[PDB]
Structure formats: structure tokens, C-alpha cells
Design a binder for this molecule. Structure first.
Ligand SMILES: [Mg+2]
Ligand SMILES: [Mg+2]
Ligand SMILES: [Mg+2]
Ligand SMILES: [Mg+2]
Ligand SMILES: [Mg+2]
Ligand SMILES: [Mg+2]
Ligand SMILES: [Mg+2]
Ligand SMILES: [Mg+2]
Ligand SMILES: [Mg+2]
Ligand SMILES: [Mg+2]
Ligand SMILES: [Mg+2]
Ligand SMILES: [Mg+2]
Ligand SMILES: [Mg+2]
Ligand SMILES: [Zn+2]
Lengths: 48, 70, 119, 134, 76, 175
RNA sequence: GUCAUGGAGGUAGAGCACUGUUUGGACUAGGGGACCGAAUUCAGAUAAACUCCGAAUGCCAUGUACUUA
RNA sequence: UGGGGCGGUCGCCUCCUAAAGAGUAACGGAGGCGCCCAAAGGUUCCCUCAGAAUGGAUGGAAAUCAUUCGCAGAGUGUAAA
RNA sequence: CUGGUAGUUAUGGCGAGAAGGUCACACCCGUUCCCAUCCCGAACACGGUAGUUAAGCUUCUCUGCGCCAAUGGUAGUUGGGGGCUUCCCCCUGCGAGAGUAGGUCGCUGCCGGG
């Protein structure tokens, strides 16, 4: 169930952040609005 | 009274077959009538059964079973 | 038999909850507000010394003209702002007082803000 | 035979018996008591033997109060076991008695039978005692 | 034949600076679990409940209401 | 406000004369009606709770709030937070409207009522009245209603003791 | 090293205000056509893993005090 | 390793031993861990528990209501402090 | 005199009894508007003052509960010395807990009305 996941920026394509989720309660790819160091602004990140 | 969640509500007129006391009251059933009693609140009349002034303890079908004997 | 709740007691409880974060220092005094059924009051307070600096009220000599009970709040707010500004007070922290920042309190705060007071 | 119904912990330290008794050094319920003059451990079997020997003499007359109880427990090792490998299994229950404690009570009988019953009980205990009056 | 025999290494709690001792900003004054001592003036509480000075000064362990204590730092 | 008129016109100074209250506002006044259906039997049944919901909604006119379970006990096959019972709170004009519709219309059709014990109170100024079926109220008919649950109707009175609450209920209507 | 001043810390002792262990008396919920017996109270005990309290020492500092390396 | 073998243990967290700063051993006395949560995190606003008695009761020792008393006798994802 | 707002370990609290007022403060009336209920104008929010001191609030009296609290004595104990060493005794310094004499129905600061 519990697994490691990595978050990738939808514009740059850089895998910036890592985190974990529960695979049963969250079968879909999670999405979050984090801060992207390359662009130096906030973008949208998706699980790979 | 939050809008939408609540059902319908409106005062009506309650009448008994024994006392005929049209006593204005609120309810959720329209009873599908229109009476002019209590002018300004001409709410629909609601037919009813034995009331306060109809019951022995309160104040003071089976007909067929008298058709055969009598 | 039911014991009716005491509005002022719970109001003071909420005021004490608010006051845990708001402190009236000498450079940045505290703007306390009290609201009744008839009228509203305001006081500028410092906590390091425990003394008030400016005040205004609906029942004061000024602000004689009145309207619905939000215009009295605006008037008392602008009068207290003018009195504080005339004494050199510019930066304050708004002490809500355990009320909600919605009605009379909000109008008083905006009236104070539009004058020379950085709330 | 007095044994506690429950204990929070099975194994206990042995403790010490320094100083006078914390409390209970005056006779309260009855009119005659058996007061320890020195300190010792008292198992539950000794209490049972003393109580039996003291009640039989009065012929089920009067009342008797037991002022001590065996809260503590002690362990032991069998013959032929080396040292170590944990603590031993508990064996019995003891009541650490300090000096000055009054630990038996008599009421409802005259001078002579009470004194003789206390004397008979005092020979079953491993501690020097004396008989006191309220 | 023993089910016991295990423990956890000590965490060295207690007080690290004495009352009346001059203190440098940002230094730990008390390591502790929960809140046995509350943070007073010019002092804050860490993530794991340690108390650290925020400005240079002199340590003083005052008393709050009846059954609890606090520590403060006063500049020179 | 016909029942408001009946209460205010003659009940208030009758009470004032009877008990010689020092002021005008020691008079007990009806304050709250609370309804609890007690549908805890529906451990797994989902239509029973819902059916109680529309039953209460029709009888009162306000949306009933489902109540959760305070604790979790295996003796009655329940866990934490299970939806148990209903909750409706009338207040204001609904006091007198519901009291009218009950004591004058719905109550008299009960089978063999001959009064309730004056000691069947809480002893401190309130009253809980029980009904053994849902057909006593004229608004809910027989065809729609499937089962009957004996619910609880409470009377909240500002009376400082019990005797004046009892006599106040008598003066307004049935004890 | 001593003296004066300020602190953190709950051991010895003691105590029953919490948690365990526990004695005698009164009454009793509950079951019983009187008998066991939950909870309340009175009086009396007990505790390394109990605490409404709580020392002597030791410890950390301050001093401009007096000696000493 | 109170000779060695058989038995048990080997890393981390909490309490007692531990002698009122910190530290402190024994094949000494008791327990847990090798996770979980997309809200069980952040912020703003609001409020307060266990239990007992009385009445309706389908429904009893115990479900859901109403009043009174009630400083925590509850809760704090999980072992203890 | 009263309203608002702070400091101080309840000597400030709990409980009991009396008095007061529409100057203030509340109860109170209402839900058109802003706003709100896992339902309910109860609360919150808004608009008003016919009635009230019944309660909130203020003042006054007490020792019933609670709380604070000596002096003397005692346990314990650093240093030194003795015994018949489950432990005990003597000299000097420190010195409790419990119990009690006694104290308490608060004391202070600022602003606005009378
Ligand atoms: Mg540890
Ligand atoms: Mg944190
Ligand atoms: Mg963390
Ligand atoms: Mg001890
Ligand atoms: Mg030490
Ligand atoms: Mg230590
Ligand atoms: Mg070890
Ligand atoms: Mg293990
Ligand atoms: Mg006047
Ligand atoms: Mg409207
Ligand atoms: Mg105190
Ligand atoms: Mg003394
Ligand atoms: Mg003392
Ligand atoms: Zn990017």
C-alpha cells in the first residue's frame, strides 16, 4: 500500500520533490502546487 | 430557516365532524379546500376526526353491525 | 428548568483567547472595543505600562448626530482615530475584543483605518 | 491464610527495616495489644499459627484484630541451580514489621485470659514482644 | 531464561545554563519533554520543546502562577 | 399566535395571582421541544433511518438531523459514529403550532388515555411524553407509514420547581 | 578552598489528595419470599516502577570578600 | 556466558534500579519498534470531556433524547514517561 | 456611585443571606436588511425600548467548605567518634511532613459618565 513517489514539474520536467502516499486510498496520480527552483516560481507537479 | 432544505409549510383550518370548531393551525398538508372563516387568513380547511371537544374523557363500519340486527 | 447562558462571560472567554497573541506595546498600542445594546466604545491601551492613551464613545459630548447603529460606530471610530493621531499615535494593533469582525466592529475598524491610523 | 488477590508486579525488592514504625503504634480497637520491640519479617504462616493459638484459648469469645498484612512477596531458587539467569519464582508473602508496631488486638475478655492468650501467641512469632494496655 | 534485559540510551535532559549567568543569543537553556518550564521573555520553545535564548542577556528563572515556572532573558 | 394569545391573555396573570411572584417575569414559559426517534435497532438497515427522516420532516416541517453514536459497545452490535436516532428542534412559533396540533387534534385519537402521573416528570421542571406509534399524528397516513417507533417528546419549562410546571401544563391543556 | 547571594533537580522522611494492595463497623443499589452483595461514610494501615508535600548533602553560576597555586 | 555445551540474546524507543544536576553495571524488574495519515499537515473562526441520578422507552447492565452535578475521574493514530 | 480595561501564588475561590437601579450595564420585543444553524433568529448578526430588577451585575454580613499560616517538639541528615552490625548509640551544624495558635468573603493602576 504505502509507497514512495516522486513529483515532476509539468513545464520543466524536473523531478524536484519526493513524498509518499497510500496506494489504496489514492489510486490516481496525485497533483500538488509546489515551488520550482529552476523557474523560481510556483508550478504544478505530478507523480510520475 | 435555511432555504431549500425545509419542506413546505402553511397554516390551515381544522374542522371536526362533531364540534365543527374551525380552529386555525399550521400544518404541512394542504387538505385541498378553501374557507372564508378567519378573514385575512383564509387557509384551506382540513377535515379531521374526534377532537378535544369530541372525546368523553377530554370534556364529557360499526354501523353495519347494527344494520343486520335492527 | 434551564439556566440561560451568560453572554458576557463567554465573550470574555473569547477575548482572553484573542489576547494570547495581541500585546499592546508602547510603540504599537492596543485598540480595545466594547459593544453593548445601546452603543459602542473604543480605547487605545498599552500593556507594558497599563495605561490608556486615547478614547471615544457614542455617548461622548461630540458625535451628537446619530443614525442606524453602524453610523454611530463609524463616527466613534473616526473620532478616536483623530484623537489618537493628534497625540502622535500612528501604528496600532486592533484588539477584536471577542466579537466577530463583521458588523459594528468592522465598521469602526474601517473608519479608524481610513484616517491616520495603520491598523 | 492472608494472601493478596492481585499484585501489579510479581517480583519486588527486599527493602529495609530502619527506624521506628511509621504509624499504628497505639492500640485503638481492642484493649490489649502485642507490640514488637525489635524489627523482623513475618510470613503469613506465622500469623495464621499465632491467630489460631490465640483464638483457641479464648474459646471463641471476644474479638481479635490482625493489624498487619503480608503485602510483599519473596522468591527463591532450587537446590542445584547456579547464579544468574534471572530472578526466582515467588514462594510466599511477608510483612516487614518495624519496632514499636502493635500487631495484634484483644477485646471482650478479662485480664487473665487476654494476657495468657497474648503470651501463647507471642511464642509463635520470631520477634521479641511485650503486652500493652490502652 | 530472561525476557528482560534491554533499555534505551539516556537523552541528557535538564538545565544547561544557570540562573544569573550571562548567555549568548541562540543558546539552549533547558532540554525537556513536554513543558515543565514555560518560555518567558526573550526566549522561545523549540520543535522538541527545548528552550533557547533569543537575545544576549542574563538568565532568570521566575515563577508564573502557583504550580508552574518560566525562564526569561534580560539584556545588559 | 392563537395559542400565544391564550397563554398571554389569561394564563400569565392567573399564575401571577396563584403564586404571588415578586415581579412579572418569574412566570414559567414554554421554551423548547426536542424529538428523538430512537432508531438504534437499524444497525444495518438503511431505509429505516431514512424513512424516519421523512416521517419527522413531514410531522414537523424542519429537516431532521441524524445523530451519530457517542460510544462503541459490542453488547448492542454498534460502533463509534453509527447513525442512531433523529433530532428535530422546534422553537419560536413552532412551540404553540405543534402544541395546538398535538393536544387538540393528534392527541385525542389515542386509544385509552386517562391522564399521566403528575410524578411522571423529572422532578425539576420539565416533562417527557411518549407515543407508541406514528399514526396518532394526522399528517402521516397509514399507507405511507410502514413501521412505528416509540419516540420521545420532551417539554422544556422555565419553572423553578415541579408543581407550577404541572399546573401550567394543565392550564394550557392536558397535564 | 571558604563566605554571602540566586537557581534547576523530587532522594531520605512523611502522607493518602491520584493509582494499586488492605482491616473492622454502619447502610445499601442489584438479585433473593430472611441471604450474598456493587457504590457512600466512619476509623485504621501499606507501596522501587504512588505523590497534596518534602530536607541534609551534592551541582550550576554571580561577587568587588578573604586566603591559596 | 558465575567453566563449556543445550536454552536465551545481539539494532532503536519508555519507565524502575540510579543514592533530589548530568552520567552509571548484572543471563536485574516491566513494556514497545522496523509503521501510519492526502487529512490524522498548515491557517482562520467556533467549543469542552468521563461518569452518576430522574422520565419517557420500542430498548435490558449498557444505544438515541431533556435537566441537574461534575478540574478532568475523558481524550491525545500507537508502548511508557 | 457606576461602566470599560490590566497587575498580583484563591488571604482573591465555593457556599449562604439581604439591598439596589431603566444614569450605565442586562433581561426584553422583532427578523425588512448584513449575517447564521450538520435542524432551530437558542447562539451569532441586525433593527428597536411597552415591562423588569427575577437573573446577569454592584454593594453589604459570615468561617460552613476551601485557601494561607507560625512557635515549640519530632523524623531525617553533612562532619567527627563508638557498639552486642536484620540494626543501634553519642557530640556539633542544618532541619522537615503531619497537628495547631492564628489570618481570609481581597489589595493595587488607567480611561469614560454621575
Ligand atoms: Mg530512557
Ligand atoms: Mg511542532
Ligand atoms: Mg517533528
Ligand atoms: Mg520511604
Ligand atoms: Mg546523585
Ligand atoms: Mg540523574
Ligand atoms: Mg544494563
Ligand atoms: Mg521485545
Ligand atoms: Mg438615576
Ligand atoms: Mg427575510
Ligand atoms: Mg492556594
Ligand atoms: Mg520548627
Ligand atoms: Mg510545618
Ligand atoms: Zn518548473
Amino acid at each position: 500500500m504505502r509507497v514512495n513517489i516522486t513529483l515532476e514539474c509539468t513545464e520543466c520536467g524536473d523531478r524536484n520533490y519526493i513524498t509518499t502516499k497510500n496506494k489504496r486510498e489514492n489510486p490516481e496520480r496525485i497533483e500538488l502546487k509546489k515551488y520550482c527552483p529552476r523557474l523560481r516560481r510556483v508550478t504544478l507537479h505530478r507523480e510520475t | 430557516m435555511k432555504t431549500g432544505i425545509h419542506p413546505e409549510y402553511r397554516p390551515v383550518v381544522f374542522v371536526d365532524t362533531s364540534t365543527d370548531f374551525k380552529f386555525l393551525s399550521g400544518s404541512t398538508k394542504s387538505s385541498s379546500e378553501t374557507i372564508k372563516w378567519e378573514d385575512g387568513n383564509e387557509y384551506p380547511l382540513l377535515r379531521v376526526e374526534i377532537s378535544s371537544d369530541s372525546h368523553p374523557f377530554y370534556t364529557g363500519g360499526r354501523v353495519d353491525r347494527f344494520n343486520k340486527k335492527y | 428548568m434551564i439556566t440561560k447562558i451568560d453572554k458576557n462571560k463567554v465573550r470574555k472567554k473569547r477575548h482572553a483567547r484573542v489576547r494570547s497573541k495581541i500585546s499592546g506595546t508602547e510603540s504599537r498600542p492596543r485598540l480595545n472595543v466594547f459593544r453593548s445594546n445601546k452603543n459602542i466604545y473604543a480605547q487605545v491601551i498599552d500593556d507594558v505600562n497599563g495605561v490608556t492613551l486615547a478614547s471615544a464613545s457614542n455617548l461622548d459630548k461630540d458625535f451628537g448626530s446619530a443614525e442606524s447603529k453602524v453610523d454611530a460606530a463609524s463616527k466613534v471610530g473616526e473620532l478616536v482615530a483623530k484623537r489618537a493621531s493628534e497625540k502622535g499615535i500612528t501604528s496600532v494593533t486592533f484588539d477584536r475584543g471577542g466579537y466577530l469582525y463583521h458588523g459594528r466592529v468592522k465598521a469602526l475598524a474601517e473608519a479608524a483605518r481610513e484616517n491616520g491610523l495603520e491598523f | 491464610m492472608l494472601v493478596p488477590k492481585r499484585v501489579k508486579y510479581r517480583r519486588e525488592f527486599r527493602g529495609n527495616m530502619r527506624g521506628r514504625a511509621k504509624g499504628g503504634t497505639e492500640v485503638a480497637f481492642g484493649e490489649y495489644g502485642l507490640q514488637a520491640v525489635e524489627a523482623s519479617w513475618i510470613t503469613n504462616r506465622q500469623i495464621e499459627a499465632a491467630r489460631i493459638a490465640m483464638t483457641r484459648y479464648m474459646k471463641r469469645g471476644g474479638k481479635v484484630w490482625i493489624k498487619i498484612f503480608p503485602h510483599k512477596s519473596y522468591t527463591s531458587k532450587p537446590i542445584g541451580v547456579r547464579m544468574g539467569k534471572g530472578k526466582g519464582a515467588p514462594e510466599g508473602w511477608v510483612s516487614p514489621v518495624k519496632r514499636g508496631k502493635i500487631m495484634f488486638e484483644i477485646a471482650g475478655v478479662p485480664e487473665d485470659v487476654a494476657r495468657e492468650a497474648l503470651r501463647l501467641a507471642a511464642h509463635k512469632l520470631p520477634v521479641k514482644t511485650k503486652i500493652v494496655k490502652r | 531464561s530472561t525476557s528482560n534485559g534491554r533499555d534505551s540510551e539516556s537523552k541528557r535532559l535538564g538545565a544547561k545554563r544557570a540562573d544569573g549567568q550571562f548567555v549568548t543569543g541562540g543558546s539552549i537553556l533547558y532540554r525537556q519533554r513536554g513543558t515543565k518550564i514555560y518560555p518567558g521573555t526573550n526566549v522561545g520553545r523549540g520543535g522538541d520543546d527545548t528552550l533557547f535564548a533569543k537575545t544576549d542577556g542574563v538568565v532568570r528563572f521566575e515563577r508564573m502562577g502557583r504550580d508552574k515556572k518560566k525562564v526569561s532573558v534580560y539584556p545588559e | 399566535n392563537r395559542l400565544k394569545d391564550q397563554y398571554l391573555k389569561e394564563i400569565v396573570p392567573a399564575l401571577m395571582s396563584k403564586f404571588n411572584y415578586d415581579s412579572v417575569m418569574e412566570v414559567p414559559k414554554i421554551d423548547k421541544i426536542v424529538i428523538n426517534t430512537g432508531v438504534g435497532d437499524a444497525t444495518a438497515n438503511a431505509k429505516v433511518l431514512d424513512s424516519a427522516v421523512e416521517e419527522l420532516a413531514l410531522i414537523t416541517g424542519q429537516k431532521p438531523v441524524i445523530t451519530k453514536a457517542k460510544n462503541s459497545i459490542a453488547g448492542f452490535r454498534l460502533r463509534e459514529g453509527m447513525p442512531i436516532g433523529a433530532k428535530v428542534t422546534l422553537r419560536g412559533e413552532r412551540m404553540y403550532d405543534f402544541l395546538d396540533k398535538l393536544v387538540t387534534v393528534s392527541l385525542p385519537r389515542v386509544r385509552d388515555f386517562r391522564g399521566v402521573s403528575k410524578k411522571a416528570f423529572d422532578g425539576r421542571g420539565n416533562y417527557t411524553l411518549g407515543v407508541r406509534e406514528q399514526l396518532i399524528f394526522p399528517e402521516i397516513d397509514y399507507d405511507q407509514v410502514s413501521k412505528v417507533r416509540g419516540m420521545d417528546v420532551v417539554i422544556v419549562t422555565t419553572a423553578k420547581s415541579d408543581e407550577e410546571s404541572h399546573e401550567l401544563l394543565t392550564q394550557l391543556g392536558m397535564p
